[PDB]
Design a protein around this ligand. Structure first.
Ligand SMILES: C[N+](C)(C)C[C@H](O)CC(=O)O
Length: 340
């Protein structure tokens, strides 16, 4: 790699480590915000559009219920998510603006991206052209180069976690499975269609799982459906471990070749995990038209700009039952979340 890249990544790691070793804590409180609308909801948390009452800025506030985090065995994952997010800085990662906790919940207040999830746009349009898929893929390649250099594995790449911003660029959201790992890690996590074989087979796995997931994402963007579909998880898993993938005839030869090397079941042969690391991907013919520096600098005109009316528009997100943000009169799970 050019010394220019080496020096960039050295500074990136220095800055990450300073924040990693001394995390920010308790930088706002709930009553600084008005609640606007629920943007998503899951088994232990929700994301809400909020507005800061003094500045008028909009934010996406992720709210995690401490008791449900404990019950679903997500303590370390939630601590990872916040400690990582407060320490990273890259053009394609959503920014954490504030965090805090109260008697009941953990809160991460992030920039709000009104363009919505890539998933919605992909399903609406059907499939992206190769140039369009490639534009997004290049951003993920650079993001993973950054994260992996910091010893971070992302572990949740999928279209729902990629928001489209006002310039048409990606912002990765949801660091719930991200982890700082020197070497291997073992937790079963991630969505079935995106899991690498070594996760399915309960092995100690490493950053190569993110490169596998990039193969899945590129396939899904370009085809409109993922490479290993089925009705039950076990049937998906059988397909993933099999070493077989079929490509639509509309895929270019270069696309197929790249995908065979990302969707390589043998992790020791998978692109991104060889001696040349990320450069085997960056130098692949499918990326021959990609100006990597221009992508990083956000100088490339994007394939499309989501339609939205302004920073408070929620039209690109869907509608959920609006539930209370209740805060117990008694502290819950204080010990478990001391460091948050
Ligand atoms: C108007 N001002 C600057 C308070 C907020 C901007 O509209 C951005 C926002 O709403 O997040």
């Amino acid at each position: 790699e050019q010394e220019s890249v080496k020096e960039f990544l050295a500074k990136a790691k220095e800055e990450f480590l300073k924040k990693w070793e001394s995390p920010s804590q308790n930088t706002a409180q709930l009553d600084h915000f008005d609640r606007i609308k629920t943007l998503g909801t899951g088994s232990f948390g929700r994301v809400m559009l909020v507005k800061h009452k003094e500045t008028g800025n909009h934010y996406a506030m992720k709210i995690l219920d401490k008791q449900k985090v404990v019950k679903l065995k997500q303590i370390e994952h939630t601590l990872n998510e916040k400690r990582i997010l407060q320490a990273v800085n890259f053009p394609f990662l959503v920014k954490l603006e504030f965090s805090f906790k109260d008697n009941s919940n953990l809160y991460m207040v992030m920039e709000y991206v009104p363009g919505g999830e890539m998933f919605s746009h992909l399903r609406r349009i059907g499939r992206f052209s190769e140039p369009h898929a490639r534009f997004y893929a290049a951003q993920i390649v650079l993001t993973f180069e950054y994260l992996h250099s910091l010893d971070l594995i992302y572990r949740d790449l999928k279209p729902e976690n990629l928001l489209i911003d006002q310039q048409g660029y990606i912002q990765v959201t949801d660091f719930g499975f991200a982890k700082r790992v020197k070497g291997r890690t073992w937790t079963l996590c991630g969505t079935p269609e995106y899991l690498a074989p070594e996760i399915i087979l309960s092995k100690g796995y490493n950053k190569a799982v993110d490169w596998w997931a990039l193969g899945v994402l590129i396939y899904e963007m370009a085809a409109g459906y993922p490479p290993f579909f089925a009705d039950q998880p076990i049937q998906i898993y059988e397909k993933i471990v099999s070493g077989k993938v079929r490509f639509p005839s509309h895929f270019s030869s270069d696309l197929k070749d790249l995908l065979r090397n990302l969707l390589q079941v043998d992790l020791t042969k998978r692109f991104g995990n060889l001696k040349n690391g990320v450069n085997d991907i960056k130098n692949h013919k499918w990326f021959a038209t990609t100006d990597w520096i221009a992508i990083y600098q956000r100088k490339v005109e994007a394939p499309f700009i989501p339609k939205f009316k302004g920073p408070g528009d929620t039209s690109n997100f869907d509608d959920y039952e609006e539930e209370e943000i209740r805060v117990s009169i008694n502290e819950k799970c204080g010990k478990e979340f001391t460091e948050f």
